[PDB]
Every structure is written in C-alpha cells, then in structure tokens.
Amino acid sequence: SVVVISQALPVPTRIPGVADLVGFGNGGVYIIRNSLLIQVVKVINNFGYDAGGWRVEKHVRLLADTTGDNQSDVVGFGENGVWISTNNGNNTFVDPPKMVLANFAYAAGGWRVEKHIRFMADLRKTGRADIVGFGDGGIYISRNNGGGQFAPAQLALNNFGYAQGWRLDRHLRFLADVTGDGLLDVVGFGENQVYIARNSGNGTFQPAQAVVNNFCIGAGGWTISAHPRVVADLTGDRKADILGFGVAGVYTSLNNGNGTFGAVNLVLKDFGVNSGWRVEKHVRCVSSLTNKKVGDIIGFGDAGVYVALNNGNGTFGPVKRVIDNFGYNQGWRVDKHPRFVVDLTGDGCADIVGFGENSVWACMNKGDGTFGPIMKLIDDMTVSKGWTLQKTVRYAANLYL
C-alpha cells in the first residue's frame, strides 16, 4: 500500500486521481466536484462552526470510506461522539450524520486536539476505514464492522501515547506500510529514536522497535518548528522511506524492505534551513509528479514552486522553478492559504491547488514534472469569502473512486 496517513495530511488522496475539494465552512459542508462544471455545492448542514458548533481546537473533521464502496464519507470527531454522514453516490450525503460511537471525543474519552491524534484508516485490509486514536495510554482502535456499525474501542498498542511521552511539539506519528504486506504500520519519530510498530492485521501492533537513531529532537536537533519530516515510497516498491528537510537540505533513510532502515544521507543541498526554508513561510511536500510513481520533491518557496525529481531510487536531479507562483512573493501565507500537491487530472502525476486570497488557483503537471500556466478555478473557499484556518477546514480528497 502506497497509502500514507500523516498529521499534516490525514486525508490521503489517490494517484492517479481527479481529487475534489472539500470545505468545512461556517454553515456546513461544501464540495467542488472535479468535473466540467466547477461550482460549490452545500451537502451537509452540519460539521460547521455555526452548523453544529464545530471547533478546530476541540474537534476533528475528515473524509474516509467507512462502507467500502470507494466513496468517501464525512467523518467528525465531535463533542460527544463520532458522527458520520455517508456518501449517497450523487454529490449528496446522508444529513444529519449518525453518531456511531460515543468515544474518541472531547466529552467522551477526554480527547484533546493538543494532546492526541485521530485518523481514519483501513488497518485490516477490509476496504473500510477503522477509527484510530493516538490516545493517552497508547493507540486505540474501533473496528469498522460494516453498515456504520463500529466496535467498542480497544487498545491496539500501549505505545505512542501521551503516557509514553509523545508530544505534538516534539514528535511525529504516521501510518504507512513499512513491510510491503499492504498493512499500515506505525512510524513514530519519538524523542531519541524513530520507531516502528508492525501491524498484526487485527487491530493490534507488535511492540515498538527503534529503527533510526536520527530525525528527532534529541537525535539530530529535528524540530517541528524548523525541520519537517515525511514518510513516502522513494524507490518504487510500495514500501515507505523516511525523508526530512534538515538544515543543510534533504536527508533520507531508505527502507531495507522489511522495515529496518538504512543510514541517514544528505541526498540534496536544498529545501533546508541553509537553503532559506521556513515552516512559517513555506510548504514542503513529497508526492509523485512522474510516471516513476515515487516521491519527488515540491516546495512552495518565495519566488514560486520548486521541484526536484526522484531518479527512481532515492536520488534527485536539479531543483527547478516550475512556476512563478503559489509562493510567498505572490502573497501565499501558511496561515491563510492552504496548498496541496495532488492529482487533479487523473494522469498519475500530481498537480497543485491552493485556496488563495480571492480564488482557488490550480496549476497542472504536464505529465513529466513540469507545469503549465496557472488557472483561476473559482472564487470561493477563500479568505475573501470568509474562510480562515481558525474557523474552517479544507481538503483535497477523492469523493469518488
């Protein structure tokens, strides 16, 4: 499994794909269906700042296939429980949503945005999303048993929890396949080590196992505030490697193939602190922009977008300015204008969309990792129309696969 789930990007998108745009705005849930007709459509009078009292700092809103039909349902970790509005198949969703489990929630379970993490993930290879919470005592799971019926939460592993020292300002946690069986394992960038927890295919993980003594805060000086880190297949074998944007530039540790990891290696003198890159100003990604289907590099910098292509094995060609936009010099701010690298045309090669000041802007990969001219898609889901990071959530996501 190519699927990777991350703090930054808890709603993975498909490659190839024609992703849609989803906004959790004040009055409810809105979608822009990737198609010949580009318009906003309100679909759920809920999951909104004013529509149900939803709060960025108390609740979590995501999209995920909870039924197994490759349609994406709206999922909200609310005040008293978990609320799902399933996809009706026709640009509409069951409304109101159904409370499926009184847990994983602020007033049910004591969940806290600033202490814990909540994802949706197909962890048993059923075609459906199980509920996954990095809680206090460890990782908790609620089995998705089909038909909106979710099993009581059980401990999957007494690690990666708040009790074992995990902290959002110090550490990073991921779901990704590090062994090749297609089952998503825990990759955690802890205090001193980077650990692994192999997925036993049953809502449990085998005990943690350190695999790299680097890429952390007490092991390399990796900070959340300066040195982003991702998990992505860089070699092409559907197993996940490690990649961090450090001081000099990009470092990596390639998967052996069984989920033990190589050695840390400055593979590129750019996208790093020395090369000018700041989390405050700039967004850095890894996604496939070519037919090699491997992690290439994309950074939204000052002048524009910067791309470095992955030869096929972990090594990277020359950095280039693929477009003079989506950058800080064109007014793109991290705290105002979400940007995403995602396939919008269905060719396997990831494109670029940003929710800007007055419009949603797109920019299409030519198919080689070079890019076209910018497109003004629509004048909605923008600052000008009322969308802030403090009161709304926005995703690119595949509603239909």
Ligand SMILES: CC(=O)N[C@@H]1[C@@H](O)[C@H](O)[C@@H](CO)O[C@H]1O
């Ligand atoms: C933040 C949150 O959970 N909001 C929910 C809302 O979505 C739901 O419609 C209502 C049902 O009575 O309960 C509220 O608590």
Ligand SMILES: CC(=O)N[C@@H]1[C@@H](O)[C@H](O)[C@@H](CO)O[C@H]1O
């Ligand atoms: C933050 C957290 O871990 N919350 C959990 C809750 O989801 C679970 O039902 C319970 C199991 O006893 O323990 C609580 O602490």
Ligand SMILES: CC(=O)N[C@@H]1[C@@H](O)[C@H](O)[C@@H](CO)O[C@H]1O
């Ligand atoms: C944040 C962090 O690094 N936590 C780890 C924990 O997950 C592991 O169980 C333990 C044993 O090595 O070491 C702790 O310090």
Ligand SMILES: CC(=O)N[C@@H]1[C@@H](O)[C@H](O)[C@@H](CO)O[C@H]1O
């Ligand atoms: C944040 C950062 O860049 N950390 C790196 C560290 O991970 C690595 O082990 C070493 C290699 O020479 O250089 C440090 O400066």
Ligand SMILES: CC(=O)N[C@@H]1[C@@H](O)[C@H](O)[C@@H](CO)O[C@H]1O
């Ligand atoms: C923060 C930022 O934008 N950094 C870029 C850098 O990575 C690129 O290599 C260089 C070459 O033109 O231009 C800088 O301005």
Ligand SMILES: CC(=O)N[C@@H]1[C@@H](O)[C@H](O)[C@@H](CO)O[C@H]1O
């Ligand atoms: C933050 C933002 O939206 N910046 C855009 C810029 O990307 C675009 O090139 C220009 C065209 O008018 O308009 C600015 O508002």
Ligand SMILES: [Ca+2]
């Ligand atoms: Ca594309």
